[PDB]
């Protein structure tokens, strides 16, 4: 049917009624075929680097050229600060990819495919137009199904720029049908020997009543560097803090201590992350400059090998029949293909439980950061990067919502674990079957 018919359709009415009895498992929502996406969440990891030049820019900034690598401020105080500005621009540039891609390609936000345990999604940005960039690899793996957890790593060996992180969410509906989503997990970006800890923001899904879902960000995201510098990004929508949706305000401070006082902000960036934003240095509000305009820079999608060459664990290969049925809008075929895949998985889980076997993750392992870790789990190292950056930001190391600070209510939750997924480059190095 035409989208204009969605809201009043029998299918949507039945869907809204199913929300009243939502059990907490988003995948249980009786969503109609017209609101289904043929893309698996394991693919979302690619959204961290769809602007190759911004992802790698920090690596080209050094003590001898930094003032030539800061468009908004040729008089930038230091290379560390020039790099923080670059990392911040990169972070902002990821937002349109992360939260607006389906609106563009599908017509609105839609229900993504719930990944199966073990699912993989790999590819690469060849950056053929920029030989100095080199190849950038994406590795994404579903390390958990109950609950859904996706781990990933994007790395550029040539320029020593590497990123790793993981993601999971917890969602609930308000009485007015707003879908509140809390993100969990974090992402770390290494630029040579300099590190950055990034925490995703919470969000809500609007437009459910009118059958035109869309993401709006809220709360805050942090970018803590090993240089001490810290960027605090606050999100808002519609009004309240800006006459336009998808708005944000980012402030860069010398350190976590200074972030307590907005007046100490070295720079203040404001605008829409899905559009244009300006930046002001210090308090010189009369000298704002364009920081980033999402509309001027088209996203660059990674190269994925043809289906014919994909391993059975690769997302698109495994979900092929389901994606095809979804595109066709065949109610019975969607139910059939999805059940076939998910039932086969349930069978595997039941067998493992009965045989005393456990699924082994391929390129990621879960490290127990608890003071009293499980006796068989891997534990972090002395100079663990997450530990030092979290300490600098005074960020909770527990499995609390992304961005939770030490002492916050969420951090004071009793019997809360501290297990985090980590990329093991060695496992990819010795990979014997998967290729790009």
Ligand X SMILES: CC(C)CCC[C@@](C)(O)[C@H]1CC[C@H]2[C@@H]3CC=C4C[C@@H](O)CC[C@]4(C)[C@H]3CC[C@@]21C
338 is in an annotated binding site: yes
* Interface pick for ligand X out of 6, 11, 12, 31 (rule CB under 6 A): 31
Looking up tokens 């534990």 gives 379
Q: Is 140 helix (H, G, I), strand (E, B) or coil?
A: strand
- Does position 35 interact with ligand X (CB under 6 A)? The reply is yes
Q: Which is nearer to Pb ion, 194 or 366 (CB)?
A: 366
Which of the choices ligand X, Pb ion, none does residue 44 contact, using the CB cut-off of 5 to 8 A by kind?
Answer: ligand X
Beta bridge partners, 163, equal 154, 189
Q: Which is nearer to ligand X, 6 or 60 (CB)?
A: 6
- Does position 26 interact with ligand X (CB under 6 A)? The reply is yes
Q: Which is nearer to ligand X, 52 or 202 (CB)?
A: 202
Q: Which long-range contacts (CB under 8 A, 24 or more apart) does 265-269 make?
A: 266/77, 266/81, 267/73, 267/85, 269/88, 269/92
Query: Nearest 10 degrees: CA dihedral of 344, 346, 349, 351?
Result: -70
Closest distance to ligand X from the beta carbon of 120 (Å):
16
Closest distance to ligand X from the beta carbon of 175 (Å):
16
Residues 197-226 that bind ligand X (CB under 6 A): 205, 208, 213, 215
| Cis peptide, bond prior to residue 60, ω within 30 of zero | no
| Cα 284 from Cα 262, distance rounded (Å) | 14
Is residue 186 within 8 Å of residue 402, measured between CB atoms?
Answer: yes
Is residue 252 within 8 Å of residue 234, measured between CB atoms?
Answer: no
- Does position 178 interact with ligand X (CB under 6 A)? The reply is no
| Cα 425 from Cα 365, distance rounded (Å) | 11
Looking up tokens 């350190």 gives 255
* Interface pick for ligand X out of 42, 183, 225, 227 (rule CB under 6 A): 183
Which of the choices ligand X, Pb ion, none does residue 366 contact, using the CB cut-off of 5 to 8 A by kind?
Answer: Pb ion
Q: Which is nearer to ligand X, 22 or 320 (CB)?
A: 22
Binding site for ligand X (CB under 6 A): 26, 29, 31, 35, 41, 44, 47, 98-99, 109-112, 167, 169, 171, 179, 181, 183, 205, 208, 213, 215
Q: Residues annotated as binding site?
A: 26-31, 98, 102, 111-114, 145-146, 338, 342, 346
């Amino acid at each position: 049917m035409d989208p204009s018919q969605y809201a009043s359709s029998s299918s949507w009415t039945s869907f809204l009624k199913s929300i009243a009895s939502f059990n907490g498992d988003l995948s249980s929502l009786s969503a109609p075929p017209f609101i289904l996406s043929p893309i698996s969440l394991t693919e979302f990891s690619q959204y961290w680097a769809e602007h190759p030049e911004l992802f790698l820019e920090p690596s080209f900034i050094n003590d001898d050229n930094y003032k030539e690598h800061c468009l908004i401020d040729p008089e930038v105080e230091s290379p560390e600060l020039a790099r923080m500005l670059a990392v911040t621009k990169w972070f902002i540039s990821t937002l349109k990819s992360q939260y607006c891609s389906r609106n563009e390609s599908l017509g609105s936000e839609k229900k993504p495919l719930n990944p199966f345990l073990g699912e993989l999604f790999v590819g690469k940005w060849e950056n053929k137009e920029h030989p100095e960039f080199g190849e950038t690899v994406l590795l994404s793996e579903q390390v958990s199904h109950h609950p859904p957890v996706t781990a990933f790593s994007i790395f550029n060996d040539k320029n020593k720029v590497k990123l790793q992180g993981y993601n999971q969410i917890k969602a609930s509906f308000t009485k007015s049908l707003m879908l509140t989503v809390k993100q969990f997990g974090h992402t770390m970006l290494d630029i040579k020997d300099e590190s950055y800890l990034v925490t995703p923001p919470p969000l809500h899904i609007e437009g459910i009543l009118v059958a035109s879902p869309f993401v709006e960000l809220e709360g805050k995201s942090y970018i803590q560097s090993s240089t001490g510098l810290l960027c605090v990004i606050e999100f808002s929508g519609r009004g309240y803090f800006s006459g336009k949706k998808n708005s944000f305000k980012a402030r860069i401070y010398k350190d976590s201590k200074d972030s307590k006082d907005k007046e100490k902000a070295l720079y203040t960036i404001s605008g829409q992350w899905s559009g244009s934003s300006k930046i002001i240095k210090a308090n010189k509000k009369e000298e704002s400059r364009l920081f980033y305009d999402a509309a001027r820079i088209p996203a660059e999608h990674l190269n994925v090998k043809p289906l014919e060459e994909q391993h059975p664990l690769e997302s698109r290969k495994a979900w092929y029949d389901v994606a095809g049925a979804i595109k066709l809008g065949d109610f019975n075929l969607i139910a059939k293909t999805k059940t076939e895949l998910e039932e086969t998985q349930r069978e595997l889980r039941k067998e493992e439980e009965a045989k005393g076997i456990s699924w082994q993750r391929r390129w990621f392992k879960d490290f127990d950061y608890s003071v009293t870790p499980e006796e068989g789990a891997l534990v972090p190292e002395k100079d663990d990067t997450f530990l030092k950056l979290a300490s600098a930001l005074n960020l909770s190391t527990k499995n609390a919502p992304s961005g939770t600070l030490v002492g916050d209510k969420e951090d004071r939750k009793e019997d809360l674990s501290s297990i985090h997924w980590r990329f093991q480059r060695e496992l990819w190095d010795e990979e014997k079957e998967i290729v790009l």
